[model samples]
Target chain A: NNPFYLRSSNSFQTLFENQNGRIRLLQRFNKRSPQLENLRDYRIVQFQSKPNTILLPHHADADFLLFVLSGRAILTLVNNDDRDSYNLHPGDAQRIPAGTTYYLVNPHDHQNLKIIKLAIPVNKPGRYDDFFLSSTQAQQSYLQGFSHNILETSFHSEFEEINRVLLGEQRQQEGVIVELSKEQIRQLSRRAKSSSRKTISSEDEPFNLRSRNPIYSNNFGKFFEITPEKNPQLRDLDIFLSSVDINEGALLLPHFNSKAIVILVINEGDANIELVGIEVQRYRAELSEDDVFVIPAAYPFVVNATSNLNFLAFGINAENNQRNFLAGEKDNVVRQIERQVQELAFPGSAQDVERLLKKQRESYFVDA
Target chain B: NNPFYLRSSNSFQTLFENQNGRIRLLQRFNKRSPQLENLRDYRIVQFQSKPNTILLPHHADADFLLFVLSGRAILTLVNNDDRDSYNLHPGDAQRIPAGTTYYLVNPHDHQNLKIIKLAIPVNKPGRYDDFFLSSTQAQQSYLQGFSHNILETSFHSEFEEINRVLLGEQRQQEGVIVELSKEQIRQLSRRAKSSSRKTISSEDEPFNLRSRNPIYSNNFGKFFEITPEKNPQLRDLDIFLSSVDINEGALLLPHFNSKAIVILVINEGDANIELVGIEVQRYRAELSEDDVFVIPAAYPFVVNATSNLNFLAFGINAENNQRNFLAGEKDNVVRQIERQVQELAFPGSAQDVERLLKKQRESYFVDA
Candidate 1:
């Protein structure tokens, strides 16, 4: 049994829900699996919104990396007096700094938008809250938390007028996700494309995983990645995002990231994962679409796909990260071991050990 | 010239000021003295308000330790749903957590309220902003940063009505400080004492310096202190506060805090100070009232009072802090040195080193 594995059906806790959209959160990895307490500063959240829906204006107390898993998104971020907007498609990634007011819009008429986020809390360890700019008593905007007198004085308007606006008279609160009319969507799109669009440096723009060439590719699998070196914004959080696509009946060789803790989010197909823990204990699990799993830093793991498998991996502590394979012709770490030590450990001749290690000519991924 | 020493006239930068009160800040020490960059996470601010003045409702992005220098104060802190009020006088200390909405009142009729604060920024290193709940365009509320439609829809009020309140219809917006009428003061005091009051644990109550007995005292001087060991709240910032009072012409012998960097704020009288820097450079200065100085961790310093001097010390990295003295009968660190090393260090017999080290019969403070 593996505490690091979260079954798709049982792991997600609904954070918010409405007729048009819903949000589900997989809390800090360490809460349920204390063995990975070193990775407690991170959280994963999933967002799904109906077409022509708007996620209201809000800011978080944590910095986040937003990745579009499906559909298209229009993101508008407000930094002080300036505003920057981005048009996002699948595989697009953006970094939202803490305290930057922003909103998301799914402009498509027929497709639901899906986004996955990695959050690093700023105020408290393993905890963060979204402060909505527009909300009612039920949803409670952070602005409404102040005393009524303070609000009245702040606005310099009469309490009656302000109260009517905050509490609402025409309808109940629209909630975090609201449906937008076609005309309003068009107007927003125009605004986002013209006056709101600010020319930003390439480094600040969103990077795409699907559009770029894969770092490693073969008949068995292909891997695409984005690190802080490619996008400096990721440097602050010391995290990286990568995706792997493996062919049916293929396997990803046993490898570990010496500098990072890896979190795998299955996007497609099914696979069996085997992880080696600190005590030399081997934990195995079968993962399907939407299943989430944690791999502690330096814990070697191998994956075998029963069907064509596609998964996204988020690595924490990614500063100068390196992936070390246990066996390969050129990239194998075992080859770096001292000859005498290797001989003694294997209780065999040096030539025999070299022959066995050199047998695997392919690196990273291969047919099992 | 010592970069760490700040003369009374040159150090403080006025943060905010009006007829009712003023605020002066000594920014993060590292900014002015690059040699003290290790102490960049802390700042010191001084606040003073006239009688019957209100500091207004606000919250800071940083956690702070507030120590009252003089006068009386009425403080109300608002958590999510509950509010706690405290009555503070000279020498009283309190901790305000980041993001907690609070207000301050100087309820006295004659004396002005004075306070000194130590801030630990949570959002960014060496930087923080105060979020006022009530403010006009000149000093905008964070809530005002959202789009007009978002604000209007959130409040469910007309744009015109909201604008009138936010932009104001009357005169200029009052500054951060406002004078209160006698009736309003009485009402506020009554409310603070009655319904708003909530009983809290001793650990949460404000700790007082003037009311407590000295931790160390002799005919020459007295030392008062507070650490996380005594008050758990200080543990979050890893800081401690202590004050020393030395009689005229007395001296505090050369000593170093191995576990902390020390910042001294002069409260009364004059003194001559000497410090040993990392390169064994001797920096010396003559200080008067209101002077500020920084001492890096493990840097030995000694102070001689030209007049009866009183100063408060704030220590960063104070977890398990220790004060190691170079000379004294029982508390001298030199005595701990091995006999062979001591003889080699002084190029003399162990007997001579012992005779010189034991000359000071007293510890901490002594007659010059």
Candidate 2:
């Protein structure tokens, strides 16, 4: 019964797709789990940049926690020479780190952008490894882990500008997501937003998690959390962003987590999940807003709201996000099971296992 | 039928033993896994110490290699203003890294040392934990996760010498192994081996994993390895060491590893294992020397060295430290079971599955 919930349907959907598919990825270590290796990485990358996509800079040994979920992005960062940029929108979030050297731009010409990352391997597992500073005709990118005399004499640089930065600008399109046209994406989005100007690290530099609207919850249908105890620059991204909203037909109980792996992504309405995949059987789905789902660790389910459910979840949680609630009354984890052990494992009778053990009620959006 | 093969019986005999049962840890998160749940920890822990044990100082969140099965040690480490010492013996080995603070002694007052270790789990899973630095009469050591004014201000001093350097000189013994007596273990082993020394770490210093012994094999037995390609100060102990010998009633064949979890430690003569224990049945054992075992990873054991064996192994390989063979010659991993896939699971034929898959052989210290 190893389904333990892993359904992706949309959010530009992914189970691995690239470039032409505009990069999609949605991984879950494809099964061989201890609850997805204790939720060390619950990927859900769903890029789709076009209006002019150009995702060419890469770096990864893992450390992810992107977010956005719609159109608008600039993302630059270079580190090791210190550089940073950000424009991001749609409930933004960021965490990057790991030999940082990013690059993404959906600086829109008129829509088509959607982030969603949440990786965290930091080295080996589904093996992160993603070096790419251009070079993809027959491959030899990221300067091939170095050695061309450390790229021409002690890094003096220039082997044809490292082969035109490993061959880009011949119509930039070398994988990990690529696309162009829409009036050449409005002439490369105005030749890349005026080619320079890296601004705003001021106002108490809030490294985006939607640069603060501060509302870790407006009560069960709201959760503006970037968490690491609310952003300490995402404290080395042990990952855990939020942004949910559940009101209509409420109800989101049935919980789990002593640490993470959540995923989710709706972004607007229609949601009727019921998870329990990894074959603890009890499936059911029907999402909307860009779609995406997965909740493995601590596997329990339910989301309901099927109409008022706006989403944007994220949580890589390598232990330490902790939530746990198998139906709460503030302290419900099936209140420690018992009751003649749930009447010999749900055979019932002890007030029929107290009416099938409160099923779910730690109260969330409620009424559903 | 989950025992793809995994057996280990001895090791001061522990299938369950704690404290007064004289240490033994043996572990496995095996199900052929990894997706960096921190290499799903691979434990061994045999322990011993005794002749004036004294193992206090603590610090762990996992990272280990250790080995030194059978008498002799000095240990000590404590980084954060560097301090080190070693004197370990048998085929010595040491690694320790994870917030690095250590302690171990057996300054021999009539021997009793052994060690083992291996562990890895740097981030939860059988949870590493081991804080120690104060509190024992109600247990709150590891300085109760610090704070009593960071143990007397920015960790500077006095609160009675930080509880007498954390209560260990007004009758030192906070337990994680304690012992004392034998003319006070040779007068606290020569007044604590020169009352605070901390040498070695200047110019080309190779902080001992036995300052180099290189020898990855010696005809079916020897292996004095110290990988990370033989020492990059053991690359933060991603672990993989070796020191073994076999020749005598030989046979170290029937391999299985490509990324380890091996563990072993016999340290001298007597061996014979057979593995496959999670009940695919077929289990057998016989060990001696300092005895300690665990193979579960590729699980396919067979270490027949019954007399003239000697060991010290470790491998928590994060990748590439491989060795796989179900019988070799490039075509044997049970050569893709077929001939009716071995006659619908052994009803025989195909020449009784070629004399029962040639009854084990990828040849080793041949004979018997």
Candidate 3:
């Protein structure tokens, strides 16, 4: 006798209603060669993001496809040498090459950002590895001390600019500092204290940080680093960044590199963004803070601040190789552009391209 | 919104149960030209036969295909000059041409006969008009009078023989009318009395004589006369004769017709029968008192009474041609066979053959 079964219609409805604030990362396929647990082949990682937070410049192990499920955010890709930038917005999806340096900035001051990232691998049985340039001694070498100078200027001029923008230069001389409420001051002090003790680790160090752990502090003074040897398996990486603020009119600088990526937005509130790309097609789907849209791999793209929103994003790649080399790192095309700009500023006579190249190489090696 | 419905089993059980007494004729297709309601083209009728009943010699309006469902009976084909007979049993089926005299006799004393008959028109828009040869005027014109001793002897003897077989002579002569019990007698008398007086038309025709009222006091005295004009579509006919006691060997005499036929034996009791023909083939299945076996059209066939069983038959034509005259009813083949037999009976005498031929011609007719 055949067994009888009943089909109920209520099951589908219950599943959709109960899921909230949950992100799941799945490893779909693994390659045959090195036999590493590679999510880059076909898997997605999803998580929540804080409002107005800036995603640090980082590369991927493989190409990525991003899907937005919620809030709005701006994606910026900066050319390493020339400092050229491109942006992408909410209904827009971009494909960034593996090893490309890029950043995502949420402009909304009041809402969080949510996104899902799908990592697709071009090779099988590969592992995901991240190499942070900021953590390496090579960071100082690549920037020729320019990186430290810029940081110092931004830190010291913050209160002066705030005074000028709100009350004009006449009040700047008063050395004004923005008034902070008791709660705000307490939170800031706590974050500052935490950052003051932060340290960098080299590529030879063991990986102690889990992908699900939060890496940034509230004070925004410390920069944590990840080197190549400490790279965790892509299948294990989880996105947990939350509640970083994005002020109005903040421009997320642009950059580009090798691997691809995808981003998902989890929430959006009255925010409009302009996404621009180079020789890249933009795809968008209207997501009600819950739907997911996919971004293909390998294209220069960026996004602009539109509205206050809360969202989450998961970054995915074809390979789990995360190596970010920022602009002005070495004698690359970007370095050539920088050289041309310097020459124009200083007007030269009887110029020789080879002689100029030699000078630039020497300067870069010295900085390194 | 779509309304839901439950699926139940048991919705198609009734059609598979065979309980009805009347023949359930399933029509597959209708004639192309003359519509079905016109009473032409083709028709199917099925019915069950009572045990121990002898169907009298008669002709039908069209060709017939008799399919035996269960039980068995003897079939006889006869004319003034020749006779042929056979036994038919379950799984036996046969076709008889239209206007070819024939008869079916159930040999079974207890079991009923179930058979289906398929009638087809020999002519387009074929009419089932019957013509009877047993009419008084037809009998006289055909020289079947008492003064014509030879003709009278042949006709009367055949008729009496048929009557004896149909109505057993022992019961007829001894008049052993078994008295019914009070209840049975009451039912019988009531039915008889009511059938005699009930009349359907105001014009005073005895329409309900058999059922509504009992008009004849002696049931055995009832005789049916067939008139040509009243039955203009009569065809195949046969007659049976016998007068043996129950224990004695009662043989069904052989009668011949020029048409070819196949014979079969349907066992209703433990008795033996011999079937003659090409030893065709045999098949067995789980057959109840109600399964029908169909015979293909256009084959000469017959049946023998193998046991004390009731048999029912239905027939069809090889080719539905209304214009052809049956060999049994014609002067040509019957005279030829009769003359040849006479010559053999009186060898070396041409006069005997001539005399028989003349006598056969006088008894039958040639149209033009």
Clashes of each: 2, 23, 138
Q: For residues B261-338, write the lDDT of model 2, one tens digit per residue.
A: 665667778887787644376657677776556575666777888688877766766335766666634436665666
* Superposed model 1: Cα runs more than 4 Å off: A136-138, A191-203, A338-340, B1-368
* Candidate 2 Cα outliers beyond 4 Å, as residue runs: A1-65, A69-242, A246-254, A258-313, A317-325, A328-353, A359-368, B1-40, B44-122, B125-261, B264-291, B294-368
In order of appearance, the predictions have TM-scores of 0.53, 0.30, 0.20
Question: What DockQ does each candidate score versus the true complex, computed on alpha carbons?
Answer: 0.01, 0.01, 0.00
* Candidate scoring better on TM-score of 1 and 3: 1
Tens digits of per-residue lDDT for model 1 on B1-368?
Answer: 68989886777888778888988878567767567666677788888899999887889888888887778998889888888877887777788888889999999999999888888788798788888877542376666777888988998998788766754433545677888999988877764542111211144667676566787688988888877676666766677888889999787766666446688888878988777542025577889877888876555678778899888888877766666565454455455543432332232355754655555677777776
Instruction: Rank by lDDT, highest first.
Output: 1, 2, 3
The model with the greatest TM-score is 1
Which candidate has the top score in lDDT? 1
Candidate 3: segments with Cα more than 4 A from true spot: A1-15, A18-245, A267-295, A308-312, A318-368, B1-368
The stretch of ten residues in a row with the least summed lDDT in candidate 3 chain B is: B1-10
